[PDB]
Scaffold this active site. Structure first.
Site, PDB file in Angstrom:
ATOM      1  CD  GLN A  22      52.325  46.302  33.856  1.00  0.00           C
ATOM      2  OE1 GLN A  22      53.174  46.384  34.806  1.00  0.00           O
ATOM      3  NE2 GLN A  22      51.936  44.972  33.470  1.00  0.00           N
ATOM      4  CD  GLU A  92      28.691  44.304  27.792  1.00  0.00           C
ATOM      5  OE1 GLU A  92      29.552  43.264  27.734  1.00  0.00           O
ATOM      6  OE2 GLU A  92      27.638  44.262  28.115  1.00  0.00           O
ATOM      7  CG  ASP A 136      45.013  40.195  35.540  1.00  0.00           C
ATOM      8  OD1 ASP A 136      45.653  39.910  36.872  1.00  0.00           O
ATOM      9  OD2 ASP A 136      45.037  41.205  35.136  1.00  0.00           O
ATOM     10  CE  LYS A 138      44.134  42.500  38.659  1.00  0.00           C
ATOM     11  NZ  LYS A 138      45.372  43.244  39.078  1.00  0.00           N
ATOM     12  CG  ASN A 141      40.903  42.347  36.177  1.00  0.00           C
ATOM     13  OD1 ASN A 141      42.212  42.094  36.200  1.00  0.00           O
ATOM     14  ND2 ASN A 141      41.046  43.727  35.790  1.00  0.00           N
ATOM     15  CG  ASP A 158      42.744  43.151  32.618  1.00  0.00           C
ATOM     16  OD1 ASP A 158      43.530  43.113  31.336  1.00  0.00           O
ATOM     17  OD2 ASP A 158      43.357  43.604  33.519  1.00  0.00           O
ATOM     18  CB  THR A 177      47.945  40.755  41.228  1.00  0.00           C
ATOM     19  OG1 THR A 177      47.527  41.857  39.904  1.00  0.00           O
ATOM     20  CG2 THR A 177      48.070  41.719  42.324  1.00  0.00           C
TER      21      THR A 177
HETATM   22  N1  ADP Z   1      34.572  47.649  29.934  1.00  0.00           N
HETATM   23  C1  ADP Z   1      34.881  48.360  30.892  1.00  0.00           C
HETATM   24  N2  ADP Z   1      33.918  49.283  31.374  1.00  0.00           N
HETATM   25  C2  ADP Z   1      34.253  50.112  32.625  1.00  0.00           C
HETATM   26  N3  ADP Z   1      35.187  50.107  33.067  1.00  0.00           N
HETATM   27  C3  ADP Z   1      36.230  49.447  32.797  1.00  0.00           C
HETATM   28  C4  ADP Z   1      36.028  48.688  31.357  1.00  0.00           C
HETATM   29  N4  ADP Z   1      36.839  47.747  31.440  1.00  0.00           N
HETATM   30  C5  ADP Z   1      38.111  48.237  32.096  1.00  0.00           C
HETATM   31  N5  ADP Z   1      37.575  49.320  33.219  1.00  0.00           N
HETATM   32  C6  ADP Z   1      38.192  50.100  34.042  1.00  0.00           C
HETATM   33  O1  ADP Z   1      39.503  50.355  33.759  1.00  0.00           O
HETATM   34  C7  ADP Z   1      40.661  49.579  34.488  1.00  0.00           C
HETATM   35  C8  ADP Z   1      41.476  49.406  33.683  1.00  0.00           C
HETATM   36  O2  ADP Z   1      41.201  48.437  32.559  1.00  0.00           O
HETATM   37  P1  ADP Z   1      42.316  47.028  32.245  1.00  0.00           P
HETATM   38  O3  ADP Z   1      41.310  46.476  31.259  1.00  0.00           O
HETATM   39  O4  ADP Z   1      42.719  46.276  33.557  1.00  0.00           O
HETATM   40  O5  ADP Z   1      43.538  47.856  31.447  1.00  0.00           O
HETATM   41  P2  ADP Z   1      45.011  47.411  31.918  1.00  0.00           P
HETATM   42  O6  ADP Z   1      45.823  46.720  30.685  1.00  0.00           O
HETATM   43  O7  ADP Z   1      45.812  48.896  32.076  1.00  0.00           O
HETATM   44  O8  ADP Z   1      45.152  46.529  32.971  1.00  0.00           O
HETATM   45  C9  ADP Z   1      39.577  48.703  35.302  1.00  0.00           C
HETATM   46  O9  ADP Z   1      40.184  48.097  36.454  1.00  0.00           O
HETATM   47  C10 ADP Z   1      38.376  49.391  35.381  1.00  0.00           C
HETATM   48  O10 ADP Z   1      38.150  50.237  36.283  1.00  0.00           O
END
Ligand code: ADP
Length: 278
Positions: A22, A92, A136, A138, A141, A158, A177
């Protein structure tokens, strides 16, 4: 507040896509000046006042919270860029994948579950100490640094729903969720740090059984189950799980947030102590 408006590609090279959401896509990248690797999270901005995309207020809150954070079990924010279409968070890099995908690959032993859980609790203790509700939590995350070691290290990611709770509750419904949200989220009641502790109870149940405690056939049915605290410990999954493990979960999956264990309580617990619509 405004962010660096230089072309991010002038300073970083991007590689594989790490994940999606999203209104966000996350790509591996490498800073030209240092050779160090990061995860670049591109968040789509709102195109108009009403509108798709994330409001500026929402992005600024996520950035503010991320800037405060420094703890081994939480992601950190390296830099922020923006342009007309995106805000770009240079985060990171966590290279060992989601706890979600690790769980699909291997149900864990109680020891494996408590090793993850102690780290999650330490991260949340840090956040809650700063009055930050994550909202959030889960398995998606919670990322592993390296999935090929017997006791993986984890980081909470996240912060898109995270809020500072300066009055002990906040009122805006911050709906995550359905499987993981607390009853007060389902019922659109004032929300506080307690909501994360419920999510931790759900995560623990899943770690031990491989099954989701409130999951229904539709999102609405899940939400109804959550509000009614409609879960039980299936003998098939839990018959050889220790009674203390069940005790820990029972004390987190409590409808009244005032009666639910706090993060400090969870660390002293004998087991431990050494989007919504269809
Ligand atoms: N710092 C990170 N390092 C590696 N993978 C990441 C990292 N942050 C996010 N991800 C990957 O990208 C996905 C989406 O990140 P998210 O922060 O949840 O964005 P959204 O706003 O779309 O929910 C995560 O579920 C994970 O698989």
């Amino acid at each position: 507040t405004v962010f660096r408006q230089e072309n991010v590609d002038d300073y970083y090279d991007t590689g594989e896509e790490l994940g999606s959401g999203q209104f966000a896509v996350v790509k591996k990248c490498r800073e030209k000046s240092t050779g160090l690797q990061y995860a670049a999270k591109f968040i789509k901005k709102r195109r108009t006042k009403s509108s798709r995309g994330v409001s500026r207020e929402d992005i600024e809150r996520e950035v503010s919270i991320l800037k405060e954070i420094q703890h081994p079990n939480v992601i950190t924010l390296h830099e922020v860029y923006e342009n007309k279409t995106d805000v770009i968070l240079i985060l990171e890099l966590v290279a060992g994948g989601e706890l979600f995908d690790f769980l699909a690959e291997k149900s864990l032993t109680e020891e494996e579950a408590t090793e993850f859980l102690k780290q999650i609790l330490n991260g949340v203790y840090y956040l809650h100490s700063l009055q930050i509700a994550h909202f959030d939590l889960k398995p998606e995350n919670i990322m592993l640094l390296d999935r090929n070691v017997p006791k993986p290290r984890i980081k909470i990611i996240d912060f898109g729903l995270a809020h500072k709770i300066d009055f002990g509750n906040e009122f805006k419904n911050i709906f995550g969720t359905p499987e993981f949200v607390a009853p007060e989220i389902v019922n659109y009641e004032p929300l506080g740090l307690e909501a994360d502790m419920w999510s931790i109870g759900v995560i623990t149940y899943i770690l031990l059984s491989g099954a989701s405690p409130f999951l229904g056939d539709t999102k609405q049915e899940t939400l109804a189950n959550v509000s009614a605290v409609n879960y039980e410990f299936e003998d098939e999954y839990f018959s050889n799980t220790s009674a203390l493990a069940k005790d820990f979960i029972r004390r987190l999956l409590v409808k009244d947030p005032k009666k639910r264990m706090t993060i400090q309580d969870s660390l002293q617990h004998p087991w431990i102590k050494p989007p919504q619509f269809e």
